[PDB]
Design a protein around this ligand. Structure first.
Ligand SMILES: [Zn+2]
Lengths: 115, 217, 108, 149, 264
């Protein structure tokens, strides 16, 4: 449940995300009709004093049965053109994104680890 | 005689006939799929059909941390750390899409719930997914792990120090002073240990269930 | 806020004499066969209960004197005996309370 | 709003209710017949029945000893429960306590009064209600029906 | 005093007679129910064929509870349990005497005790030959579908795969509410148990558990004519043309004891 605020971890090799910064990246909205952000929901993440779109891949909110509950909030950066900002993803990514409605093939291709 | 938790019905005004019908269906499914005996703290490997994948099964290994639900809707959760990420998956015992259930290591832990392991060190929660089954003795009690886990800094998900939780597997002394325990003990509610209004007797029910389960076999 | 005008007795009389505000009669009155006094169907007799309660105090008073001290509750069964009644073999190993009065007819 | 409630609110708190119930239970055991408010008497009736079961369980039971000590403030009663109350009720499987309605107190508050006692006691029998005899005309008419059937 | 006194059925009944009274009531209820078991053998009213626009009678059921259900696709659907108890036709109302648009039929279920009921209610039921029922409800039924009073109704009237509408009183929340009749539409039926007359209905039903509910065919435009392939007047166990299975399942429903579902 990526609600307002909700400090998050940038799982990407993008220069902004990869470079350490003293302020954590924050998520204070979601690209959805509802205000709550879950796995597969686009967001906009303020990183290194810049705003970049990111895709949620994990959350710490309890999930439905038969699904794994993550302990950290993980996101993947996506460019305006639609291609991922980063060329690789480190943290395991759930495979449910494929069937989820939306364009997730590009992100999944960049995901090395699947759980 | 190990009576699985789901067979025991919960108190209420629901007709007992529903449980009898539910048990019959549960017993029939048990013939199709064998449900091994396990307890919280045991490491299990469960085979389930993958909906996203086509004709490919999934096996997840983790220590059993919680048992919940009754009847056909009973579910169990097993926890593990994969790629350094703690993950908990809830499996419904009678779901048709669970192909097989394997108890890799049958054992018990100090507490009936292991949610505090999230606050414990990762090593206590890390388990090899590919670990082979360990020898077990059928006509014996499951091994009881008495190791006390070490906690992370004071901010925790729940106030395990409080007497109500009554966690016996936490090294509170290392992370909490005796004075801090006394503050937690302020919520003792000692009459609760002696309160007969919160006690539910299922001795007769448990005994009756055993014959019914065996009779179907 | 104070009343804008005095309330008339006629208006007041109707309010207090409305059936909802009147005292209702009771049909659950019963007679006590034992004492012949009145009682309610769901209420016990009191004239006979007066004998029972007072007799209990008299029995209890005898018990208190026999014990002679606090925290002296026996660990064995107790029995009450009245004048003209002699302990039986079954009464052995039981606290015996002796009452000067004869066995009451109601008490058995 | 008292829908689905299974516990009465008595005393100044939950602990007071236990202590007040504890005091009532201790008094009832000592005397075996106590008069109290109907609401309180009904609440404590269940506790008394369970106590007899603890006595039946056996003296050597550690839980019973702890339970008996806590509930009974006067320690002379602890032998009595295992050696007086428990032996008496061995044949009985339940219904150890008898509770009946008493006329309301004429103390200007009109509280509902009831008497709770332990069955099989040596105290004088309470004035229990007696059912109508079969010799009554209606019962005799039913007796004729029974004979025909 | 020559005044009215409060009385109850047990006031003048002796213990020996009281036990006999309890046994007699059970015997009387059993005898009455058995006598009404065979409607077709009780001068049944003429049977008419189905035609478009016909409306069948509904049933009254008790809310047993809810349980989870799995389908052959692996999806889990929560379902509610409804039990039809002692469902019998009581009073038929002619079309003219009730409403020119359609006739109505009164159906009652869940037999109740006779000790604390008015004499008028007992008198009506004595004529009908059945024990009193907890609730009386009125169902709009076309003339062709009219059924003679006293006909037993069973859960087999509905069939798996049919959508149904259930209406029941909402739970009362006290002064703040509730205790008002409400209806839920578009609930599918997954399975029916013939032995216990239990119908499995998709979704939730308003009201508390053990509460009587009214069951009638779905009135949505899509399901305008679903009775053509169902028992048109009703299902008659008396006919026994072909004994139905004890448990009826929908095709999509995954039956217990079936092989584990693999998403191949
Ligand atoms: Zn009297």
């Amino acid at each position: 449940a990526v609600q307002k605020m909700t400090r998050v971890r940038v799982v990407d090799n993008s220069a902004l995300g990869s470079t350490p910064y003293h302020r954590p990246p924050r998520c204070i909205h979601v690209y959805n009709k509802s205000g709550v952000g879950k796995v597969g929901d686009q967001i906009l993440l303020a990183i290194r004093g810049q705003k970049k779109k990111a895709l949620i891949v994990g959350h710490r909110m309890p999930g439905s049965r038969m699904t794994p509950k993550f302990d950290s909030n993980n996101v993947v950066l996506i460019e305006d053109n639609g291609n991922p900002v980063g060329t690789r993803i480190k943290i395991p990514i759930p495979t449910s994104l494929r069937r989820r409605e939306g364009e997730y093939s590009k992100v999944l291709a960049i995901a090395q680890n699947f759980v | 005689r190990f009576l699985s938790p789901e067979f025991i019905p919960p108190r209420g005004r629901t007709n007992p006939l529903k449980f009898k019908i539910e048990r019959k269906d549960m017993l029939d499914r048990r013939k199709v799929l064998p449900i091994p005996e396990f307890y919280v703290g045991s490491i299990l490997r469960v085979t389930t059909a993958d909906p996203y994948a086509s004709g490919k099964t999934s096996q997840f290994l983790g220590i059993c941390i919680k048992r919940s639900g009754n009847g056909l809707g009973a579910t169990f959760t097993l926890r593990n750390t994969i790629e350094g990420q703690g993950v908990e998956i809830c499996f419904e015992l009678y779901n048709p899409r669970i192909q097989e259930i394997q108890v890799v290591k049958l054992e018990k832990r100090l507490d009936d719930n292991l949610l505090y392991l999230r606050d414990a060190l990762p090593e206590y929660s890390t388990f090899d997914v590919n670990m082979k089954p360990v020898p077990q003795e059928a006509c014996q009690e499951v091994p009881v792990n008495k190791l006390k886990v070490k906690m992370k800094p004071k901010p925790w998900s729940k106030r395990w120090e409080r007497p109500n939780f009554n966690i016996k597997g936490i090294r509170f002394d290392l992370a909490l002073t005796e004075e801090q325990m006394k503050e937690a003990q302020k919520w003792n509610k000692p009459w609760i240990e002696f309160d007969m209004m919160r006690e539910y007797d299922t001795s007769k029910i448990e005994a009756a269930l055993w014959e019914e389960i065996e009779a179907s076999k | 806020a104070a009343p804008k005008n005095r309330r008339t007795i006629e208006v007041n009389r109707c309010r207090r004499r409305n059936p909802q505000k009147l005292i209702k009669i009771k049909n659950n009155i019963d007679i006590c066969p034992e004492c012949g006094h009145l009682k309610q169907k769901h209420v016990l007799c009191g004239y006979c209960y007066e004998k029972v309660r007072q007799e209990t105090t008299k029995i209890r008073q005898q018990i208190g004197a026999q014990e002679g001290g606090p925290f002296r509750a026996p660990s064995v069964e107790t029995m009450v005996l009245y004048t003209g009644e002699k302990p039986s073999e079954k009464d052995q190993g039981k606290r015996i309370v002796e009452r000067n009065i004869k066995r009451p007819s109601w008490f058995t | 709003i008292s829908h689905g409630r299974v516990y009465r609110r008595l005393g100044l708190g939950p602990e007071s209710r236990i202590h007040l119930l504890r005091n009532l239970l201790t008094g009832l055991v000592r005397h075996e017949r106590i008069e109290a408010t109907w609401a309180r008497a009904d609440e404590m009736r269940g506790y008394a029945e369970k106590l007899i079961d603890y006595g039946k369980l056996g003296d050597t039971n550690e839980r019973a000893m702890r339970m008996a000590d806590f509930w009974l403030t006067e320690k002379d009663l602890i032998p009595k429960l295992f050696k007086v109350l428990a032996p008496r009720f061995q044949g009985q499987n339940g219904n150890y306590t008898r509770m009946l309605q008493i006329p309301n107190r004429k103390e200007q508050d009109r509280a509902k009064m009831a008497v709770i006692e332990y069955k099989g006691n040596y105290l004088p029998p309470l004035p229990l209600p007696h059912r109508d005899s079969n010799l009554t005309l209606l019962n005799q008419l039913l007796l004729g029906l029974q004979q025909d059937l | 005093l020559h005044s009215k006194s409060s009385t109850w059925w047990d006031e003048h009944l002796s213990e020996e007679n009281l036990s006999f009274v309890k046994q007699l009531v059970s015997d009387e209820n059993k005898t009455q129910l058995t006598s009404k078991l065979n409607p077709l053998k009780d001068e049944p009213w003429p049977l008419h064929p189905w035609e478009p626009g016909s409306f069948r009678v509904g049933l009254i059921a008790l809310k047993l509870g809810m349980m989870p259900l799995w389908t052959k696709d692996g999806q889990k659907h929560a379902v509610t349990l409804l039990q039809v108890q002692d469902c019998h036709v009581l009073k038929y109302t002619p079309k003219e005497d009730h409403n020119g648009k359609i006739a109505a039929l009164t159906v009652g279920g869940k037999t109740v005790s006779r000790f604390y009921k008015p004499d008028s209610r007992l008198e009506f039921y004595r004529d009908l030959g059945l024990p009193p029922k907890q609730i009386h409800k009125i169902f709009h039924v076309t003339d062709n579908a009219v059924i003679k009073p006293g006909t037993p109704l069973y859960a087999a009237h509905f069939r798996p795969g049919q959508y149904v509408d259930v209406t029941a009183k909402t739970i009362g929340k006290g002064f703040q509410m509730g205790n008002q009749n409400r209806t839920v539409y578009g609930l599918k039926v997954w399975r029916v148990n013939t032995k216990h007359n239990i119908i499995y209905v998709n979704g939730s039903v308003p009201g508390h558990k053990n509460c009587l509910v009214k069951i009638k065919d779905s009135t949505l435009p899509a399901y305008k004519d679903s009775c053509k392939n169902l028992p048109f007047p009703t299902y008659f166990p008396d006919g026994d043309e072909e004994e139905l299975p004890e448990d009826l399942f929908d095709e999509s429903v995954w039956q217990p004891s079936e092989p584990s579902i693999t998403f191949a």
